Amino acid sequence: LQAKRFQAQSLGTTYVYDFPEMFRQALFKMWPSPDKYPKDILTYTELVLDPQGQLVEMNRLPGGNEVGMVAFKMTLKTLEYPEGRDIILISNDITFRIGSFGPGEDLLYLRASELARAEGIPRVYLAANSGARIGLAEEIKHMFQVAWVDPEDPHKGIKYLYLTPQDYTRISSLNSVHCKHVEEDGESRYVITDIIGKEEGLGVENLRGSGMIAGETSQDYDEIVTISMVSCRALGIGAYLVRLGQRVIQVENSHIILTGATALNKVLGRDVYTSNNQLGGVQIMHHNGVSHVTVPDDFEGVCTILEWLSYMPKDNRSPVPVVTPKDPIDREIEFQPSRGPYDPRWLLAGRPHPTLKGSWQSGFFDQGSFKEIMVPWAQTVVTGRARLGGIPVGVIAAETRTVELVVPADPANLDSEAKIIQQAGQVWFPDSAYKTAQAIKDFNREKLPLMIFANWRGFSGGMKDMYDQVLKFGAYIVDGLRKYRQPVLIYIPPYAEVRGGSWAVMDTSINPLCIEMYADRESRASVLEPEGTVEIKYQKKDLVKTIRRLDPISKQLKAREDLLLPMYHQVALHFADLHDTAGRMLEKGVIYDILEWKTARSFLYWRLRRLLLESQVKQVQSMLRRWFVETEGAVKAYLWDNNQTVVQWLEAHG
Amino acid sequence: LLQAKRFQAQSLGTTYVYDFPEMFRQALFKMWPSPDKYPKDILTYTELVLDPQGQLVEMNRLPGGNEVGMVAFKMTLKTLEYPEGRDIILISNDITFRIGSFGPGEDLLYLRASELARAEGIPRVYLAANSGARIGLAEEIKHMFQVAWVDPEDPHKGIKYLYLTPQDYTRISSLNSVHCKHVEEDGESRYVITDIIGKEEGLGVENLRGSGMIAGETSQDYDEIVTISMVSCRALGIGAYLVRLGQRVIQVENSHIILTGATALNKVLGRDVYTSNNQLGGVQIMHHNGVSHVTVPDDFEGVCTILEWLSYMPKDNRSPVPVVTPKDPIDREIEFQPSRGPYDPRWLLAGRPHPTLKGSWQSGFFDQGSFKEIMVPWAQTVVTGRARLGGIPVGVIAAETRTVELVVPADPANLDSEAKIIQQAGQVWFPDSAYKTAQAIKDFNREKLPLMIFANWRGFSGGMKDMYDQVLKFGAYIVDGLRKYRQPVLIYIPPYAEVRGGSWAVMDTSINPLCIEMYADRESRASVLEPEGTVEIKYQKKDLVKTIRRLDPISKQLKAREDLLLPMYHQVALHFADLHDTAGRMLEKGVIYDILEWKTARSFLYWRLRRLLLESQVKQEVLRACPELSHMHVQSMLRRWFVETEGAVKAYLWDNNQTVVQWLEAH
Numbered sequence A: 001l002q003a004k005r006f007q008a009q010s011l012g013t014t015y016v017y018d019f020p021e022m023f024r025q026a027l028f029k030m031w032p033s034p035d036k037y038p039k040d041i042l043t044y045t046e047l048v049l050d051p052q053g054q055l056v057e058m059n060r061l062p063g064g065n066e067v068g069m070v071a072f073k074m075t076l077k078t079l080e081y082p083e084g085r086d087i088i089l090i091s092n093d094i095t096f097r098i099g100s101f102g103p104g105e106d107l108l109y110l111r112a113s114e115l116a117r118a119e120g121i122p123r124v125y126l127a128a129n130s131g132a133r134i135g136l137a138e139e140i141k142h143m144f145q146v147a148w149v150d151p152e153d154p155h156k157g158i159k160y161l162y163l164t165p166q167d168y169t170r171i172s173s174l175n176s177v178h179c180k181h182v183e184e185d186g187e188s189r190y191v192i193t194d195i196i197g198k199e200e201g202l203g204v205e206n207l208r209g210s211g212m213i214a215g216e217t218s219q220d221y222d223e224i225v226t227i228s229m230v231s232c233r234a235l236g237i238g239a240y241l242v243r244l245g246q247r248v249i250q251v252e253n254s255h256i257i258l259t260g261a262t263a264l265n266k267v268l269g270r271d272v273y274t275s276n277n278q279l280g281g282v283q284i285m286h287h288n289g290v291s292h293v294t295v296p297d298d299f300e301g302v303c304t305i306l307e308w309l310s311y312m313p314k315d316n317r318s319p320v321p322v323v324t325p326k327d328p329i330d331r332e333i334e335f336q337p338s339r340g341p342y343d344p345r346w347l348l349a350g351r352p353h354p355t356l357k358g359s360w361q362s363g364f365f366d367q368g369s370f371k372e373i374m375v376p377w378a379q380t381v382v383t384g385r386a387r388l389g390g391i392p393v394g395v396i397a398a399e400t401r402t403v404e405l406v407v408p409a410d411p412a413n414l415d416s417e418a419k420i421i422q423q424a425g426q427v428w429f430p431d432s433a434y435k436t437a438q439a440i441k442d443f444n445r446e447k448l449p450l451m452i453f454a455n456w457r458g459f460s461g462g463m464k465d466m467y468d469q470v471l472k473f474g475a476y477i478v479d480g481l482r483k484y485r486q487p488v489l490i491y492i493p494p495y496a497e498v499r500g501g502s503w504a505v506m507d508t509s510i511n512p513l514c515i516e517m518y519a520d521r522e523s524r525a526s527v528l529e530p531e532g533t534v535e536i537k538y539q540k541k542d543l544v545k546t547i548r549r550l551d552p553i554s555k556q557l558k559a560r561e562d563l564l565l566p567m568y569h570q571v572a573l574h575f576a577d578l579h580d581t582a583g584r585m586l587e588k589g590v591i592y593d594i595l596e597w598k599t600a601r602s603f604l605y606w607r608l609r610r611l612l613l614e615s616q617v618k619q620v621q622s623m624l625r626r627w628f629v630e631t632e633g634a635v636k637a638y639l640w641d642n643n644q645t646v647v648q649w650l651e652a653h654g
Numbered sequence B: 001l002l003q004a005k006r007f008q009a010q011s012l013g014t015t016y017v018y019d020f021p022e023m024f025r026q027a028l029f030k031m032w033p034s035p036d037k038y039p040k041d042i043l044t045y046t047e048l049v050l051d052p053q054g055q056l057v058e059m060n061r062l063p064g065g066n067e068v069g070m071v072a073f074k075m076t077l078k079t080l081e082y083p084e085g086r087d088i089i090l091i092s093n094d095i096t097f098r099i100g101s102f103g104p105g106e107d108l109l110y111l112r113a114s115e116l117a118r119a120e121g122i123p124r125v126y127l128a129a130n131s132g133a134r135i136g137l138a139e140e141i142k143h144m145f146q147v148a149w150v151d152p153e154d155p156h157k158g159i160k161y162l163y164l165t166p167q168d169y170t171r172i173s174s175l176n177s178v179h180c181k182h183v184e185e186d187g188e189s190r191y192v193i194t195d196i197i198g199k200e201e202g203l204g205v206e207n208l209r210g211s212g213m214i215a216g217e218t219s220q221d222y223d224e225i226v227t228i229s230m231v232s233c234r235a236l237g238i239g240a241y242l243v244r245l246g247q248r249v250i251q252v253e254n255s256h257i258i259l260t261g262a263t264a265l266n267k268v269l270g271r272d273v274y275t276s277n278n279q280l281g282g283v284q285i286m287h288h289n290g291v292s293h294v295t296v297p298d299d300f301e302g303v304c305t306i307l308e309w310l311s312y313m314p315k316d317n318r319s320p321v322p323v324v325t326p327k328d329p330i331d332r333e334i335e336f337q338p339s340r341g342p343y344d345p346r347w348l349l350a351g352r353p354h355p356t357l358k359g360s361w362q363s364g365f366f367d368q369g370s371f372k373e374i375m376v377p378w379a380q381t382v383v384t385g386r387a388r389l390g391g392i393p394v395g396v397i398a399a400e401t402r403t404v405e406l407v408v409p410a411d412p413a414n415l416d417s418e419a420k421i422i423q424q425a426g427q428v429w430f431p432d433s434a435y436k437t438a439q440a441i442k443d444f445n446r447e448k449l450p451l452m453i454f455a456n457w458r459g460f461s462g463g464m465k466d467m468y469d470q471v472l473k474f475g476a477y478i479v480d481g482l483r484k485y486r487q488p489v490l491i492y493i494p495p496y497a498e499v500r501g502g503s504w505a506v507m508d509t510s511i512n513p514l515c516i517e518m519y520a521d522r523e524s525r526a527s528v529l530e531p532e533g534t535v536e537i538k539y540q541k542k543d544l545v546k547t548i549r550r551l552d553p554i555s556k557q558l559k560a561r562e563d564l565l566l567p568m569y570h571q572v573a574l575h576f577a578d579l580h581d582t583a584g585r586m587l588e589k590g591v592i593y594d595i596l597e598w599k600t601a602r603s604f605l606y607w608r609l610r611r612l613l614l615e616s617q618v619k620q621e622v623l624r625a626c627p628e629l630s631h632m633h634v635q636s637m638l639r640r641w642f643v644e645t646e647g648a649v650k651a652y653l654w655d656n657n658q659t660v661v662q663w664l665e666a667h
């Protein structure tokens, strides 16, 4: 017990059978107000496989593992689900054969993953592995013979390897070797054509059990909630498993590798790499978007899992867990967006008052609810989870400030150095387009609604960015949104803009059943900005036609026009901006309704509470409207355009 | 009379839209074998025009008479694959009508001809020669609006607001072209302009809802039907998006696929960085990154590339693959012999027109002249294309073994940038070639094509820069693409080729056992690690020393004998680890269907693919009436039906592919 408990702590990780006590303890932390802690906060049954190759809920004593993989079906008690929520907890045993994957490790991972898929409950995976198992025939190793090209003289080569007829006969019929009988020199010998071995998990068959678990993981992300935690290391198959599950928590001083540092130096020849953390540590994986969040220790990772889960429904057949809000809906929004650049997280989470202490300047979402993912990667777009009157939502927000990308130096070219790049705010770069698509896909498979705070000038059209695939990454936004199954609320806040190519990828017509567009009183939208519109449709000739109409002096002339030209151009710009308003967006029907920031929280809440209520009842629209008319009256029918009325009605009638 | 529009298109380096149908006709004559066996009405088409209710109607009319800068055609084409005819939808911009800009009607006519191709489940062909979303200003309000200056002496002080005189607010009806707040400044009535709407439709944000409409439709099209796009002259904004959402792109030389022009970007940067639109989205960029699958010198050569791509694709999303009678026999051996060292894998696929003599050809795996590659300059460690195996069209993916020389082109925005040469080791999946592979898998799956993988991978790139460039994300896209694969997948490791660890994992039969079939050659290899790797962890100096003591007569002083024997008994350990990596082991462990031989692999895999295709159609007819039956109820039915007709003496021949195909084709 303490021998395995030492081997794990010496490797910096948590011993596998101690993990459920980290879950029971973190549930106490997440729980609000003691004394009133619930009875049986954490209940579980260890998942083991029987000799029939089938899973069984049998409960034993810790340490008694015959395979280097441990799974548990658990029931957790949370503020979201106080009676309990179920998950499947798979984990690698870092003590047993150094966390390698053999047939028995692949099979348990598969059968527990298939059980979570059948129930539709979250699959939480704990990674600490050495990848697929490796093996040579040790029986054949201590018996095999060599036939040299010159028996003097090891140089010149080898003809083949053989077995003495006594030894070929001794290993039966056991099927461990394929041999061709040969009469050479004067002795009978069995040329080893193929080495098979009388053991499982020696080569090729460990890849079939790797493909098996990759395909299952691939499919789970599409039907259930998958979460992966990297502790110590994730190698080859272990690294691909975390990726296919998409939501990765990387502990500090851990690595997500495909091949090791020594292995890569051995192939390349020279000593390129220093460590495995270099190749796939936090500085690589938290920065390129493979890792969603970093944590100091395994305990903190256990907390981040439950934290993410608190935004997610119980299973794939249950709605989002809406909780009684502590922060009211009847409040205005203290924080006010500026015309110039600002941090979009203020717009979401609020901020401490700029001058006053210890005051808080409120934001769109409920205080303390805004939890961001993929923070260091593709900083021109903000991705995360939040709560709106207790409704957990997926959050996507454009960054308006110029950001800093630090491409690290390539240890492979000794003349390489870190490339520093500036990325302009309100722009979808190849990376930010990828991030926006990825968060769309991830939040859709969590069965979460989506909230986008829109502020985009367009996609980057520069040579490098076009070479780097912006066209391909922008197309993935259009499809992520088309495939969206829950409500999508698109909002342009005050002094924000959505221009040409950006609107086209998120418009109501891509998915009208989910997408709804809301524009602020002070927001803008058009094909080009006024400058672009002015240069094509409001040229110098028209500009001179305007002076010779409005200027009373313009009745010599060239002296008067050349003075007013930069002034009547400012006129043209202002004229063009008047065609880009929310007033025009409403007249044309491209948006649902014009919003006012201070009251946008309360409006969007009731509209969101409505849509989620309306969809559950459906799991047909005219049927819902007629049932309102039937119960409230044909005289009250005008209130069907009022969300609070309809919300309070749906919550009552049912 | 309309020859001026024809002259306006020639000067823009493109074809006039009403001349494209006659190019199709001519291209079908070129692609028709031996005259005069030319079929009656090789091309028959109708023009698709929108009615005033916004509905598509079939019209037989004279050219040059469209009142929207978009044109659509419902074409019936007589080809070798379908001699009685196949249907396509042809949509194209009209570069002479408001410079091919996308307005209200242009967007509705693209959406309606697309939905018709969706509803009919047939190919949708789009020819791009556009200018992106249409822009405009309210011209009426322009010659009438007033400026309220903050200091009118003195206009340099700025603008307070723009307004209307009481006179002009009345004149402007009942027209709803402006929105005003009534003001009393100084003493006279002024109607402040708050919002300019405009009389004419298709100015601002309504064009972007029309763009979102067609974007979402093309995105659906690609997933459901065959999508092909060609680029002539230019593809701007929404136009660039359309070609990409359709995925399969032919870019004509000298044309550009861009989001924003060089002039506008230079104004935005405040620096004269770009000199041409070609530096942004010309073939130098689009053909070198995968957005453009192929390039052609002119509009007629690309019209030929569409029909060429179509010759591998079924007539609709319901039909089977167009199987043509083979001119190149199935009964033949492959002449080209893969080497132990690197070779061009296009020699393994298409052969070569003979090394010594000249020669016609030294035969390859596929039928002569049938291999047609896509994405030639992009991610050169993987080869992607289409080909025919005894007249069966397939998607082709082959690992490249030669060390590829990648030229990273100079960034005119970056001052220290030069044309950089990077080395891409053969047999390795990099962030770019993993992406290229998953792109081909996903795209060929939507063509409803069987896939054939000629595998030779050492694994994925594990270096720091490559891990940072997303090799895990892209490698995972191979898993997701093969799992969702719907037609047979024939993976084969050629002679002297290898599949190691990480590379087998992404493509194993367990990902899609209903589709995936694994075959290995007698001279191929596979395992978790390369011999050198297996020997490094599992056959250490301790075991190496032990062997020296057991197999060396002299080793019975000691330390000196073994030190001069260690470099050689090490090579012996490599020989030992390599015999675990043979096809013999792969077959024993049940990881491969069978061990094949290079010479006879073409004959073998043809009858197995003919079998797989024939049986899948039987399985479909069966699971149409009773979708509760499985693949195995279908397997034993045909198996027992064969029993039981031919034997039971010939029962062992249910395992022979040619025999079952012969029984199938006949029965």
Ligand SMILES: CC(C)(C)OC(=O)NC[C@H]1CC[C@H](CNC(=O)c2cc(-c3ccc(CN)cc3)nc3ccccc23)CC1
Pocket: A424, A427, A457, A458, A459, A460, A461, A462, A499, A500, A527, A528, A529, A530, A531, A532, A533, A535, A536, B260, B261, B264, B265, B267, B268, B269
């Ligand atoms: C440069 C950064 C990194 C900021 O981003 C990009 O590379 N692209 C993002 C974005 C940039 C703005 C663009 C919208 N452009 C305009 O509204 C605009 C257009 C034209 C213009 C003129 C003629 C044509 C011909 N159709 C097109 C544009 N000229 C201008 C001059 C000054 C300021 C803005 C503009 C979207 C992409």
Ligand SMILES: CC(C)(C)OC(=O)NC[C@H]1CC[C@H](CNC(=O)c2cc(-c3ccc(CN)cc3)nc3ccccc23)CC1
Pocket: A259, A262, A263, A264, A266, A267, A268, B425, B428, B458, B459, B460, B461, B462, B463, B528, B529, B530, B531, B532, B533, B534, B536
């Ligand atoms: C080769 C490059 C760096 C261009 O590509 C990669 O980044 N990844 C492909 C990679 C996949 C993993 C593989 C490591 N596997 C081994 O089996 C291995 C090979 C050799 C090895 C060394 C030298 C030679 C040349 N005589 C051949 C193999 N040495 C090792 C030492 C320790 C552990 C594993 C290995 C490497 C390829």
